[PDB]
Amino acid sequence: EAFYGLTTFSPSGKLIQIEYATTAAGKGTTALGVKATDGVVIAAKKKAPSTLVDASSIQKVFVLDEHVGCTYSGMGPDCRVLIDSARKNCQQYKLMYNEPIPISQLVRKISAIYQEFTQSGGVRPFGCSLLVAGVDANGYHLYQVDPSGTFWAWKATAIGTGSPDAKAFLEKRYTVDMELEDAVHTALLTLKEGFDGQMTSENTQVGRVVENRFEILSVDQLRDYLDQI
Amino acid sequence: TTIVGVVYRDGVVLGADTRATEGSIVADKRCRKIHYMAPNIMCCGAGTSADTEAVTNMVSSHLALHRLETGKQSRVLEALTLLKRHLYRYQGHVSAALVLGGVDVEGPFLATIAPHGSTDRLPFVTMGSGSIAAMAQLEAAYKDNMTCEEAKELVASAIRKGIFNDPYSGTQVDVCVITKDKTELTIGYDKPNERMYPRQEVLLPPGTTPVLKEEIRQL
Amino acid sequence: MAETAIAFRCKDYVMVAAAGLNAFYYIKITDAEDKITQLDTHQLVACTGENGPRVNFTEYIKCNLALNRMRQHGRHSSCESTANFMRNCLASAIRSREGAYQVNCLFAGYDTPVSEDDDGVVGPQLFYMDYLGTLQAVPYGCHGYGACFVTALLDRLWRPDLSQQEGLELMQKCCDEVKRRVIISNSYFFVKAVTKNGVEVITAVH
Amino acid sequence: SYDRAITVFSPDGHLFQVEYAQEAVKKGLAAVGVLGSDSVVIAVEKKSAVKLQDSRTIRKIYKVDANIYLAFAGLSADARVLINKAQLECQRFSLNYEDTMDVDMLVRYVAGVQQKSTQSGGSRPFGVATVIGGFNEDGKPHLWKTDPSGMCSAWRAVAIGRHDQTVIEYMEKSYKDGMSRDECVHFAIKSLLEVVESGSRNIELLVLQYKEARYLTEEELQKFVVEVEKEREEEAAAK
Amino acid sequence: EYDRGVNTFSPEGRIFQIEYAVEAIKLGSTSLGIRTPEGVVLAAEKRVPSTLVVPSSMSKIMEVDSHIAAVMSGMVADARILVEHARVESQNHRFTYNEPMSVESCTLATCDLSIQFGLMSRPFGVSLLIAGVDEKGPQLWQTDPSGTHTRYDAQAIGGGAEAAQSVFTERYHRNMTLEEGETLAVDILKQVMEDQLSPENIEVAVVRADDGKLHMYTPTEIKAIMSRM
Amino acid sequence: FDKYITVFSPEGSLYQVEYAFKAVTYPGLLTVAIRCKDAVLVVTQHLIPDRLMRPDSVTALYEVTPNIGCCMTGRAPDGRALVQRAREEASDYQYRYGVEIPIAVLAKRMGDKAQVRTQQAGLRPMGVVSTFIGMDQSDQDGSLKPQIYTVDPAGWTGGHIACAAGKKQVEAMAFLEKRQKSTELDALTQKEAAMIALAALQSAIGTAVKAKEVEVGRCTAANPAFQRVPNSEVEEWLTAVAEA
Amino acid sequence: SHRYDSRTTTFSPEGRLYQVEYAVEAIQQAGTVIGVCTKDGVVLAGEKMVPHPLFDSESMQDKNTSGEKMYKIAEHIGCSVAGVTSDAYALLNYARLSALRHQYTFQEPMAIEDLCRILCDEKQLYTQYGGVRPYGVSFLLVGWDRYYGYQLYSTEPSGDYSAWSAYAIGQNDQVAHALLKKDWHESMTLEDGMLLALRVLGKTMDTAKIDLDRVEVAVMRKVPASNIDQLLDPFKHHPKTTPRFQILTRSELKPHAERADQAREAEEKAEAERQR
Amino acid sequence: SIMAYSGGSVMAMAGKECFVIISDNRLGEQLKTISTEVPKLHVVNDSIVYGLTGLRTDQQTFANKVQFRTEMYKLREERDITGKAFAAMITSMLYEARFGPWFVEPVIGSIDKSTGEVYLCATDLIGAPCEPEDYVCAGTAAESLHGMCEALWRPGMSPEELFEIAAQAMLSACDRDSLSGYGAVAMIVTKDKVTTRLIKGRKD
Prior knowledge:
By secondary structure, chain C is α+β, with helices and mostly antiparallel strands. In chain C, 32% of the residues lie in helices and 30% in strands.
C-alpha cells in the first residue's frame, strides 16, 4: 500500500540503501566457491547458534535444479526468496525449452529480482549475496550476485565475514589446472582458516557441480574430505 | 492408444502401445507414452497427445519444485491431486486420460485420472481406445501379489490385445516397472509387429529430380 | 465480391484499379466512389469491402502512418513496412471481440531511396492482402467477382517490362473484361498508378 | 499505483510544485513566436554549435500535425512527452472527425494535459512552457502559449524560456499588426537577439505559411542576422 | 510542505487545503455578477499580462449553455476543467430531460467535481460565479473550492472582491434595470482593477430574463456602457 | 528514520525486526519444546494473575492441523493471527496437494510470510516466535520421527532438538545445552524429556511451577495427533522433577 | 508511511528534479565510454573495472552480443552504458524487446532515433510518475538505419537524448569532450575513428599506453551479407551490406591499441620540440 | 477445413549428419491460386529450418512470433537456439492458445553442429510434438507424402541421395493434391553447408 520508493540517490551519487544492504550481505557466515576444469565446489559454514539446533534442518547450500545450486551470505530469510524464485525460473525455463537453464540466464533473472527490490515501491533491497554454481553447454560456472543486482562470474571467490581474507588465501592456492578433488580440498582449507573450533559434517555444508549435475555432499561424503585436510 | 498399469507385490508396472496417430495415419510408430512425473512416479497418457504431454510436464515440474521445498520423495497422492484439480478446472476440455503409477513410502499406488478429473485408485487399470480389450486380458489373468516377471508379461499381454484388436494402438509394448527403489523403463519390451517383406530400395541416382536454381552456403 | 479491384506491377510503376460502384443491397447509388485511398506520397491501397470496415481500416492505417511520419521527423516508411503493418492490424482483428475487418486490400507503392545511405528496394511494390491478413507480394492481384477473369487475362498478357502506355491499354482490357463478364455493374473504374514521381490519377482509362 | 498528492496549496494560495515547474522554464532555452498577416514565425535558441552534435539536422521546433508546429522551453524529456501526446491527439482527432484539428483546439488539449499534471496524485507538473503556432483549414494564422499551470493564451507575438519577460517587454514596444513573411522573420530574430548570444549559429527558426512550412537554412538566416545585428548597432548609437 | 496531509482539519475546524485554495482566489482577477429582474450581468477584468495577447483568447467569461454563463477567478486552468464538466452536465440534462438545466443544478453539478480531492490531489484554486435564466427567473450562484454553492443577488470574487462588496451594500437595490446593472458592474471594476479601464481590458456578458439567452458584449457594446457614466 | 520503517541501518540491520524480538521477551512468558526419541513436548508458561480470568480460554498452544501443534510466544494477538495464517496455509496445501502439510514446509512457508513483513514497508513484523511441533513421516522406512521448527519475526525457520522462546530463553537454553553434554537427548523416553523441559522452565524463571501455571502439548509415534496433556499427567512429572 | 516518502518525483525550489541531478552525479563515478560516429562505421571504447586475477569469462558461445561495457540491443543497434549496471540490464532488456516489437510489427529494423526515443520515454516516466528513483544510467546507442546512416546517441537519466558525432559518458566526460572537439573531422576512416576513441580513452584514464586489460571496444559497421536465402522469399530484397555490431577480442584490439600507443608517442616527441 | 484453406505441404527427412526439409510453392484460397512463388520454409539459424503449414494468416503471424522469440533468445542467451529447445518452444507457443489455436502445423528440421545428430519435429496445431528418427510431413499432401516417404526413405543416406527422394516424394504427392504444387523449395542442411534448391514440377 506504501507504493513510494525506499531506495533513492544521495547527493554524492550513490544509492545509500544498497551500500547498507551490501553491508548486510558482508555480515553473515563465510561461504565460497572454487571452479575447476571438470566442475565447481561451493562450501559454506552453517555455524549454528547453539548445539540444540538440529544441524540437518539448517541448509546453507540449496539445489536450484539438478544442474545448478547456490549458497549465500547475510539474511537467510531474504535469500530463501531469491532461491524460491530461481527454482521457479529453472522450471519455467525447462517447461519452455525442454533444457536445463544456462547459469548465465539463471543469474540474470536472479539479478533482475535484486534490481526490482532497489527501484520498486515500498520494498527494501535483499540483504544477501548469492553464490550460484552450475553447469550448462558453456561448461562450469561460479557466479556471485549482490544486493545491487550486479553479478560477477568467478574462477573462485568468497562472501560473508572472512571474505576479504578468504579471497586473499584463495588467490595464492588457485591454479587454472586445479581438478575437482583438489578444489574441494582447496575450498575446505579456505573455510578452515577463518574457522574457530574444528570443522565437521554438521558444522559445514559442501555442494559441488560435477559431470552434468549439482549435488550437496551427504555427511558421509563430507567426512571423507574432512579426514584429509 | 492403450495404456495399462498393474500393482504387483514390490511396486507398479505401466504399459503403453507406441503408435501416435493424426486421424487415420501413423505419424510416429515409436512414440513414448510413459512420461517421467518423478523418480518414483511414471504417468502414461491417452487422449489428446498435446494435453497429455502439457499436463504431465506442468505437474512433473510442480512436483520437482515441491521435492526441493520439502527435501522428500514426491508422494503419488500429491501427483494425482495436482492432475485432478488441473483437469477438473478445465471441465475435460483438457482431454488427457492418464494412468499415474508410482511407489511412495505408503506403498504401490496406481490411479486413473479420466479427463473430467475423476480418480479411481485401483490394483489394475487401463485407458485409451484399446482399454476395453486390455481390461479383458487384465480381468482374466490378474491375481494379487504377482512377481515383477508375471506382472510385465501380463501388462505386455494386455497392451498386445489393444495393439491388434484396436487400430489407434499399435507397433510395440513399452513397459515401465516402478519398484520402491527404482524405475526401469524398458522400451520395446515386446515387438510383436516386426517387418513383413524387406524394403525394396528404389534407386534415384543424383541429378534425377530437375532443378531450376541452386544456392550453396558454406559455414 | 460486388466491387472489383485490379492491380499489376511493371518495371517502373504499379497500376491500381477499383470499382466506382457504391451499392445498397441491389441498388446502384452511384458509379463514382474512389476506393483507392492514398496512404503516402508513394503508397496507395485498393480496399474493397463494405464501406464501414473499408473506411475505418484505411483511415486507421492512413493516420497511424501519418503519426509515424511525425514521430520520425518526415521519414517516409518503406512499402514492405506499411504492408506488414496493415496485415499485422488485419490479423490482430480476427482474434479480437470486434471480429475481422472484412476488407480485401491490394496495397501498392514505389520505394524511392529515402536518403544517401538507403540500400533497400528501389522501385514498385504490390502486395495482395486477404481480410484474414494473408499478405503476399505479387506481380498482379485482384479482389471481387471480376478478380478471376482479370487474374487469368493478366497471366496471358502481363509481361514485367511494359511501358506506362501499354499499362493503360492492358488496364482497359482488365476493366473491360469485368464489364463484359460480371453481372454486377462495375461500369466505372478509378485507375491510379504509382511511379517514382508519386501517385498520378489516370483519367484516360475507366 | 503511487497516487500521493504532489501538487498542493501552501498558506499563501501558491501551488509550489507549479511555481517550481515555471522556474524550470525560466532556466530552459528561450523560444519566440511572431504572428503576421499571412505567416507565423517560431524561432528558438539552441544550446550553441558544439563541434560534436550531429551535422545531420536535428530540429528544436517539433511538428505536431501538417498545419501545427510547436517550440517548447523547459525539460526536453517532458516536452517530448507533451509533443508525442499532442501528435497522438491530432491523429486521434482526424480518426473521430474527418477534419484536421485546428490550432486553438490542439492548444486547449495540450493545456488540459499540462493542467491534469498540476492536479494528479502521483505526477509532478510538466516543466514545459509551449509556443504552438499553425494555420486553421479556413486560412487564419494562430499563435498560442501554454505555460506549465495548464493556462493557455493566444498572442500576436510571444516568448518563453530565459528572460521571457525582457523579450515580451521589448517586443510590445516595436511590434506592428500587419507584417510580411520577411518583416516577421526579421522581427522574430531581432526579438530573440535581445537575450540570446550575439552568434547566428544558435538561433534556428521555422516560417509557417498556409500549407507551407519551411525552416531557414544557415545561409538564408545569416543574411537576416547581419541585416538585424547592423540595426542593433543603429539602436546602440542612438543610446 | 508535505507535513500535513491534504484531507486535514486545523484546530479551528476548516480543512487546510480549502482554507488555502480560497487565498488563491484573492490573488486572481476580480469578477462580479448582478441579479436584476430584467436579467443577470457578469463582468470580469481580463488582467492581460501584455499588450500582445489577443484579448478574445483568455476569456474570463464562458458560455456553459444558451441560458447560463460562468465567470471565474483564480487559477484559469482549473476553471476550464469545472466549466467543461458543467457544459457536459448542462447537455446531459438537455439530452435526458429535453429541457434547460436549472442554474441551481448546473452549480450543484460543478461542486460534484470540487469535493472529490484526496481522485484529484488538491481542490480547484477557483471560484466560479454562475449566472443564468430558467423557470425561477434570473439567478446568480457562486461555487468555492469548499463545494459551498450559494445563490447571491450580487457578489464579487477575486482581487478587490472585498472592496466591491463595500460598493454593492451602498448601490445595489433588487429592482434594478439591466442597464443600471451593466452601469454598476463597470463602475465597480474601474474603481477596483489595477489598470485603467478600456473596452478590451474587461469582458461583460448578460443573460436577459425576456429571451433567456446569453449575449457576450463586444468592445463596441462595453464602450456604450462607459459612455453613460 | 532507519528505525520506524523496515530499511537497513548503516550497519545492515533492520531495526524493526530486532525490536520484534524484544516483543517476544516483553510479556514475560517462557515456552520450552523438546524432541525425545518417539515424541515432542512443548511446555508453555500459562500465568493468569486475575482470579476472575477463566484459565481454559487463554492458551499459548493452538492446533494448526490435527498432526501439527503450534506454540506462539510474544504478542498473544500477533500469535493468534499467525496461527490463522498457518491454518489458511495448511488448508490451502491440503486442497492443492491432497496430503497433510509436512511441518518442515509449514514452518518454511510461515518463514517466507514473516520475511515479506520485513521487506514491504508499513507492515509491522508479527512480534512473536512460532514453535511448530509434530511428527514427520521419514520416507526411508515409514517411521514417524518427531520435529520442532521455530519461525521468528526475521523469517528465520530452523529445526530444533530442543528450544526455548520468551522471557529467559537465554538461561533456559543454557540449562538445556549443559544437559545435552550428559545425555543424548534423542535417545530419551517421553517422561525423561519432559523432566528436562519442566526443569528448564523451573531453572529459568527461578521458581517451582504448579501443574496449573504450565500447559503442555504433545505428539507421539503411537498417537501422532497434537494433544494437550491433562494436568494429572503433568503433576506426575513435576513431582518426578522435585525428587531428582 | 506518507511521513517517510523521499518524494523522488517532485521539483525543488530552484526548479530541478533532485533525484535526477544526483543520478547524473552517479554516472560521473562510472567507467568512461567514448563513442565516435564515422562514415565507415561507429566505435564505442569503454573503461572496464581493473581485472582481479580470479575474474572469469562466462564462456558465451556468441562473443559479439555482450561484454562488460558494450551490449547488442538488436543486429543493427549496439550500446554502451555508464551508471548503475543493475538498471542498465533492466532497460537494455526493455530496449531489446522494443527494437524487436518494432520488427515483429513492421518486419524491418527499427530506426535508432526511434529506439532512443522509446528507451528515454521509459526513463522520463520514473522522473514524473511513481515516486520511485529514476534509472541512474546513461546509454550511448550506436546503430545504422536506412534513414540517417551510422548514428550515435547519448541518453541521460532525465530522459533527454541528443545525437552526437562523437561523445563521452562517465568518469572524465568533460575532459573527453575537450579532446574529441579538437581531433574529430567529418570525413574519417573506421581505423582513424578507432585511433581517436582509444587516444581519448587513453588520456582520460591517464595511462602511458592503452591497457588492453581495462578497455573494451565495440564497432557498429556494415559488412557483406552472406545468409541471403533468396529462394525462400523470392520477392523480398536482401541488402548487399547488413550492419553487424562486433565487440573486439583482446587480440583483434591489439594492432589498433599499438597504433594509439604510437600516436601518443609521436605527440610526446612534438611536445618535446615545442619547448625547444 | 480452415487448415486446407491456404494450402501447402511441408516435409523434412533425416539422413546421416544432414536433413532435407522441402515445401511446395503454392498459396491458395480454397481451389483458386494467388501465387506460385510462396515457399513455406523459414531459417531460424544455420542448424534449424522450420516449415509452417495451414492458414497462411497464421503461418505469417506465428512465423513473426517465432522470429521475435528466437531473436530475443539469441540476445539474452548469447547463443543460437538448438533444435530440441526451438521445437519445445514452439509447442509451448502453440499450446499457450490450446483454446483459440494457431491454424499452423510446424515441421522442424534441425542438426546439432557438434554431434551431427538430426532432430525432426512435426507439431500439430496445439503443440503435440512427434519426433521420429526418419522423416515428418504436414499440410494438404500429408496422407500422400507419408505414402511416398515410407517407401523411398532408408536410414543412413547422404545429402544428394536424400534430396532426390525428398524431391520425388514432395513432387509425386503434390501431383495427387489440388492444394499443393507449383514445384517445391527443398533445403539440404549439413554440419558443413546449407544447399537451397528450387525444384521444377507441374503447373496445376
